[PDB]
Design a protein around this nucleic acid. Structure first.
Ligand SMILES: [Mg+2]
Lengths: 134, 61, 62, 375, 384
RNA sequence: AGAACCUUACCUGGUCUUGACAUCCACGGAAGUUUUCAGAGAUGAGAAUGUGCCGAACCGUGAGACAGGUGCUGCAU
RNA sequence: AAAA
């Protein structure tokens, strides 16, 4: 019953994911191959969040989610890391459509009842990372 | 139907060469997967099967 | 007494048990004895090929 | 966790001194490997895992050590049984008892082909190599941070090649004597492969890494019997890397730390920038040199002959011209912006790196290591 | 050859089954070590080396292995015995028999301190290191080409370090299972201590070797990667007051991958130009003479010919030579200020003859001489 | 018994690799001779004009024996 | 588990 943000297809048995599943007991290489086979369609290099569901018989199923908004905002602005001092140092610029584009994909993981509400969550996400909206 | 390897004890090096071009897995990975037959290697099947069958590697589509 | 270690290279440390013999060293003051190479804890000189018996070196296996 | 337990035939201890001694014949006569497992399993089928006296008298070495390492329900144990029949019979006996005393466990047996100790040429060539493959497979399929080598069972000759794996990869090894009662995490002296000895072989492995096969005679002509184990004969007149070879190839491929050096032109230029910029450049080069991730980030425009520029950051008064040889990070020039701009202005027209290395002996060399005793 | 065999209590196997198990307590209740070993020796003195059946059945491990390795009078046998009471007793029994079976042999028994399997902390900190130091000392003493390890006796945990030593020194090892009938030359792979991950740290280790301890913050700066600190955690040890020092494991590795020294040479800027210009005449001789002087204080004391003020003195390698050096000793560093020839040396003596010249040079210390680089050069194109 | 360039052996920068200067080998070209463009020049490219002596004149290219050194020691001479 |  663990939640991870492993890479798009770079699901190594490496320490980023390796020891996490070990305490439960699921086969490490089994999950790594299963995750990659369905995330090949995902754009390259994305920390797609997956929630693992392990059982008592040492079996597991997992569900993948849309990429995090902060990741989507980082690629939308063409940057790699956020502002060190958000709302003090400004490190990018994205249009409202770029907010709509990110909101639409994350709408599968949002909770707002409208595109405007979903956007405002993304707008709040943008301010918290120093990315101003332009 | 995914391409799988049944038997490759004839010209093991050539089968590695095929999957090297076919997939690009490194020499360690490519040799290990060939020696760990059977396993899922990947008209599309026929293309690599012809090269595999050329050196005597068995193919199961 | 002070004893002189001949040859090239040795393996003598403190608390080593060695055999000394007579023979002074001309330029070293106060040294009147020699250490017997190849006897007791003193090992022979390595790679010696001539005058081996003087340095405790067994004949090469050829 | 995962326990890579070596398996030894201490389980069938109860048949000690009885007329047919416990040998591969004895397993054979009673029916076979599976049939003999039940007979062995009977003698200690009752003993517990929490009872101290049974741990030290009535159970195998794998069971005693595993019970001491704290085997639980959520665990996975591997038994590297021997190739001999008496070895495998006990393997099928330990597993039944382990899957009985701790239900919900996953024990699987690997039969290391040709692990017999009655023949030398086979053991030197197929035993340790196969055992080296099997262990290095499980560690790489479960991560170095989760495997615990258990070199207590089995022959005394496998133990060198279990612990040595632990030292190289990083997994620990835990041992416990029969009469003792304390687990002993064996010391792990940091070791690696001798780069100096192995460096000339780099082009040789390069062919194999590309064409995946080389004719044997050409391999022998190209290249000291220790190097032989690095190479496994595929069998059709070619040779490919043995499992040890893949370790060496990766060791000769992993990036390492670097120690900066300064050409005679850099040392003249560093000092005149020290007065205006404190001791900032001294730390930066050392910081970049001893961090591979930092080095790969800062590569500005790359020049010929393996030269590539570095810079502290945006709007800085220094940009370095460095290149790598062995474990040394040679520094050729250290220039400010205007000199840097003109060089790149010149390099637009023709080649640049050729002109620098051409005058290496007259102007730059010798490179002096970056240790300073300013006082 | 010289055989560095380990020892174990296989020699006393005929006592298996008796109500008091043969162990440390048993030797204690049989009149100390000497009394038991004689008694044990009597229990297998009638076994014959040529007897194949008695070799496997009745004799010990070391005797059996050595018999297969061809032990004769012209060989030296060294037995390493565990610190335990019974461990020493069984080794002695073997030494007695080996003299009888091979008269004219030179067999010494060696005791390793702390080599016991009852204390976890003592074994892995002192027992293994003492054992490792014993073997490395003996290999160097006898020299390569004559030592062959025999790791068939003793505890299973001493085996890895016996074999690992074999790879470091290129020393073959051999083993023989009891029911087997063939020696098994253990494979050897080209492994070595981690030179790659320590050469970047040479400035700190040299300081720690001379100065007792260094601050940890200095050490932390030296290792940025988390993995590097995780791997090299065992070598260092906290000494108190926010400092670290080489743990006894570290002192073993460092005293193996680094030659001994007394002073670390350094060059001023003016010396560096002086050395480079003289390379056309004296070749590499100035580099060798500087390192030799810095290595041995006895040589440095010989070279002093004229002493200036403020602690500067001149070194001359002797009559018939041309070069001469102006050096001074600070802490543990051998600072080199100038390197001159025969003609200039006379002038520099004339100036000091009239006025103080030692004070003139030290006056210009921060303007012409410092900072002092270290005498490590790299001219040829080659990388390890 | 005579440093503005040259001398010049030194410095910065641009450049050459059997080579500025020799003997050979092969292959290819009379030698020389008006010019144009790029470059600080070295040099590079292109276009004209010659194409004789009787194989040698001079030449360009390719390989390697070699050339080359005002480099050290006048305490080897 | 001091020649599995
Ligand atoms: Mg004269």
């Amino acid at each position: 019953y663990v939640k991870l943000q492993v890479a798009a297809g770079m699901a190594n048995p490496s320490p980023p994911v390796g020891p996490a599943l070990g305490q439960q007991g699921v086969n490490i290489m089994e999950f790594c191959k299963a995750f990659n086979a369905k995330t090949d369609s995902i754009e390259k290099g994305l920390p797609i969040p997956v929630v693992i569901t392990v059982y008592a018989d040492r079996s597991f199923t997992f569900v993948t989610k849309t990429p995090p908004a902060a990741v989507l905002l980082k690629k939308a602005a063409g940057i790699k890391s956020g502002s060190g001092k958000p709302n003090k140092d400004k490190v990018g610029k994205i249009s409202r459509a770029q907010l709509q584009e990110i909101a639409q994909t994350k709408a599968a993981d949002m909770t707002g009842a409208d595109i405007e509400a979903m956007t405002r969550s993304i707008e709040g996400t943008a301010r918290s990372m120093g990315l101003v909206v332009e | 139907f995914d391409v799988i390897l049944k038997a490759a004890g004839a010209n093991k090096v050539a089968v590695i060469k095929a999957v090297r071009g076919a997939t690009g897995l490194g020499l360690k990975e490519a040799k290990d997967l060939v020696e760990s037959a059977p396993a899922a290697l990947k008209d599309d099947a026929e293309a690599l099967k012809k090269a595999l069958e050329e050196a005597g590697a068995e193919v199961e589509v | 007494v002070t004893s002189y270690i001949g040859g090239e290279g040795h393996n003598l440390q403190e608390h080593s048990v060695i055999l000394i013999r007579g023979g002074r060293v001309k330029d070293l003051p106060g040294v009147r004895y020699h250490t017997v190479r190849g006897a007791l804890d003193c090992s022979g000189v390595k790679d010696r090929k001539q005058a081996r018996s003087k340095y405790g070196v067994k004949r090469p296996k050829a | 966790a995962v326990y890579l337990c070596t398996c030894g035939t201490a389980a069938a201890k109860k048949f000690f001194g009885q007329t047919p001694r416990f040998d591969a014949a004895w397993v054979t006569e009673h029916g076979g490997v599976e049939a003999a497992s039940k007979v062995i399993y009977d003698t200690f089928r009752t003993a517990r895992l929490d009872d101290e006296v049974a741990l030290k008298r009535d159970l195998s070495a794998e069971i005693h050590s595993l019970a001491r390492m704290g085997v639980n329900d959520k665990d996975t144990v591997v038994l590297f049984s021997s190739e001999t029949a008496d070895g495998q019979a006990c393997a099928w006996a330990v597993k039944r008892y382990l899957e009985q005393a701790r239900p919900g466990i996953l024990c699987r047996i690997e039969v290391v082909a040709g692990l017999q100790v009655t023949d030398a040429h086979v053991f030197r060539t197929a035993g340790v190599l196969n055992f080296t493959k099997a262990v290095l497979h499980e560690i790489d399929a479960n991560g170095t941070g989760q495997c615990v080598l258990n070199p207590t069972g089995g022959f005394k000759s496998l133990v060198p090649y279990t612990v040595l794996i632990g030292m190289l990869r990083g997994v620990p090894a835990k041992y416990i004597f029969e009469q003792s009662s304390a687990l002993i995490p064996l010391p792990m002296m940091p070791v690696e492969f001798a780069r100096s000895r192995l460096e000339p072989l780099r082009p040789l492995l390069e062919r194999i890494q590309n064409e995946t096969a080389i004719p044997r005679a050409e391999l022998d002509k190209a290249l000291r019997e220790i190097l032989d184990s690095l190479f496994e004969d595929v069998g059709q007149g070619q040779v490919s890397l043995s499992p040890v070879g893949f370790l060496i190839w990766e060791e000769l491929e992993r990036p390492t730390a670097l120690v900066p050096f300064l050409s005679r032109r850099a040392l003249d230029d560093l000092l005149k920038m020290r007065a205006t910029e404190g001791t900032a450049p001294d730390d930066y080069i050392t910081r970049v040199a001893r961090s591979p991730e930092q080095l790969a980030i800062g590569k500005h425009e790359s020049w010929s002959k393996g030269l590539f520029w570095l810079k502290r950051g945006e709007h800085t008064r220094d940009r370095y011209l460095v290149s790598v040889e062995g474990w040394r990070l040679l520094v050729w020039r250290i220039v400010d912006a205007d000199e840097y701009d003109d060089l790149l202005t010149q390099n637009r027209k023709t080649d640049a790196g050729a002109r620098v290395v051409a005058e290496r002996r007259e102007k730059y060399a010798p490179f002096v290591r970056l240790e300073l005793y300013e006082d």
